Amino acid sequence: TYTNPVGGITGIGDPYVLKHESRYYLYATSAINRGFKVWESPNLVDWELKGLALDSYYEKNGWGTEDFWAPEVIFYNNKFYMTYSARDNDGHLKIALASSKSPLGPFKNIKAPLFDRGLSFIDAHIFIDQDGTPYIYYVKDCSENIINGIHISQIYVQEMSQDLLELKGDPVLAIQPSQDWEGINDAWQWNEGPFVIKHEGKYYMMYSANCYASPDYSIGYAVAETPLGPWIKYSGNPILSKRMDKGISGPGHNSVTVSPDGSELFVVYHTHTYPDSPGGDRTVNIDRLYFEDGILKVKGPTRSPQPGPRSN
Ligand code: NA
């Protein structure tokens, strides 16, 4: 069995898991002044810290001053590509692209920043469709995005070039705060942390809304017929939300992976380490993710013993 939070990993946020060759690699917001830690597991339950996968102080890097957030790693063209964001010398948060021959690094910058529009961007997520076309989903961050008086984080999407170095065409708005559960009467509003999966020919974008430092941080999804949208939010959002009666606060900024035997999906998400006084100290959790009647569902959030991720 497992009991959340799995691995006892605290002082993090934004857990991204990649499965590769029967091992799992977790990358997270961690060393915020410097880079990103990686943890390894054979089973999604037992985790071992394996150092900085991306270190801005590594001799081949050097980019970014602070605010190293939300790394994601894909295996594409027979190597590993990491996206992340950090604050540049000009004060704007920007997305960067790095690569490595190994999931444990060292990752080396290949285009840092990946793009630059004089504004703040975070939470890049690269989705490779079944036909091999890459798409990047990313956040135009509330810090520098004010629309009709609201500081608002919006998720955009663009198709990428095959080499991942260019974002094609104009940015396409995917989603922005719009549903009642997303704090649409607040001065600051968020849709962030996109993660896209495909199921039965449709595309499902999981995302987080409300403030990361509130118990009300929570996960919803939207559905599209094509990766560039239109993206239509699930009416029953959020699909993963707090259970303060279980000490579960602010479930958010998730990734998705599969069990060791390939038979079932898990959502990997953070919650506040200290629900009595929430903030940036978050911890890693997993729970079962599945589709039923065309609805994406989570069995959770749990904090009691659950059957281990299915394995042979
Ligand atoms: Na992410």
Side-chain angles (χ1 to χ4, degrees):
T1 64
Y2 75 88
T3 301
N4 282 318
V6 293
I9 300 166
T10 69
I12 61 74
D14 315 318
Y16 181 95
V17 173
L18 183 61
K19 188 181 182 182
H20 193 254
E21 296 187 339
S22 301
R23 307 297 304 194
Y24 298 89
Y25 302 92
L26 162 73
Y27 310 85
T29 303
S30 48
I32 52 171
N33 292 340
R34 177 175 182 160
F36 307 103
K37 291 174 169 170
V38 59
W39 297 255
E40 188 183 317
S41 175
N43 60 11
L44 292 166
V45 180
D46 306 309
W47 293 93
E48 62 181 336
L49 175 59
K50 301 235 170 159
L52 294 177
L54 177 300
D55 186 357
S56 65
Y57 300 175
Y58 182 55
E59 63 96 355
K60 304 191 187 305
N61 292 335
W63 184 82
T65 65
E66 61 177 341
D67 295 320
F68 285 83
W69 303 340
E72 298 203 4
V73 179
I74 64 173
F75 184 71
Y76 178 77
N77 287 346
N78 208 31
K79 72 180 188 176
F80 301 86
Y81 289 86
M82 181 183 288
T83 51
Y84 64 96
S85 64
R87 198 171 302 278
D88 210 344
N89 291 303
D90 62 9
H92 301 296
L93 301 171
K94 308 177 191 173
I95 289 158
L97 184 68
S99 72
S100 182
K101 290 293 184 181
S102 161
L104 299 177
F107 282 77
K108 69 177 186 177
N109 291 331
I110 65 179
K111 197 170 175 171
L114 177 60
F115 64 96
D116 190 353
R117 302 167 188 162
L119 294 170
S120 284
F121 301 92
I122 69 169
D123 283 356
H125 171 72
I126 298 174
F127 169 70
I128 308 303
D129 206 352
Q130 287 178 317
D131 70 356
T133 305
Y135 300 87
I136 188 171
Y137 296 84
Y138 58 91
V139 173
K140 190 178 192 189
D141 187 72
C142 60
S143 58
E144 304 193 76
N145 197 27
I146 304 172
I147 301 174
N148 290 322
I150 307 305
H151 279 83
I152 187 163
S153 288
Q154 304 174 300
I155 295 164
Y156 287 82
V157 57
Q158 288 174 267
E159 186 177 340
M160 313 185 83
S161 55
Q162 286 290 308
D163 60 14
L164 312 182
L165 305 177
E166 184 209 2
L167 282 66
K168 293 176 130 190
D170 295 329
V172 181
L173 178 62
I175 59 171
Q176 66 183 334
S178 64
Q179 296 181 298
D180 290 279
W181 76 278
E182 302 178 305
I184 54 169
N185 297 317
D186 297 332
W188 288 73
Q189 302 181 19
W190 299 263
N191 283 177
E192 65 185 2
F195 192 100
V196 175
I197 61 180
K198 193 177 188 176
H199 183 257
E200 294 182 5
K202 294 179 181 170
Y203 302 86
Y204 295 80
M205 181 197 298
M206 298 172 80
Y207 67 92
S208 298
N210 302 297
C211 182
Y212 80 97
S214 169
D216 294 316
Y217 202 58
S218 36
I219 296 166
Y221 76 96
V223 65
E225 301 187 322
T226 198
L228 296 176
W231 286 96
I232 304 301
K233 285 170 178 178
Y234 174 49
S235 68
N237 280 337
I239 67 170
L240 192 60
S241 60
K242 68 188 184 184
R243 286 296 302 279
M244 300 297 286
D245 53 329
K246 297 184 172 184
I248 304 169
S249 178
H253 198 125
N254 74 280
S255 57
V256 180
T257 189
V258 70
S259 62
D261 77 343
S263 72
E264 62 180 358
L265 297 178
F266 278 81
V267 58
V268 183
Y269 62 98
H270 66 52
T271 56
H272 299 295
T273 302
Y274 300 106
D276 291 343
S277 197
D281 186 344
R282 292 140 310 164
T283 190
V284 178
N285 306 272
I286 69 178
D287 271 313
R288 287 178 165 84
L289 183 71
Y290 63 102
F291 294 88
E292 178 170 44
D293 300 311
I295 299 172
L296 183 57
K297 304 186 179 186
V298 181
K299 185 182 189 312
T302 67
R303 285 285 238 261
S304 58
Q306 303 296 307
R310 284 170 45 83
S311 69
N312 287 313

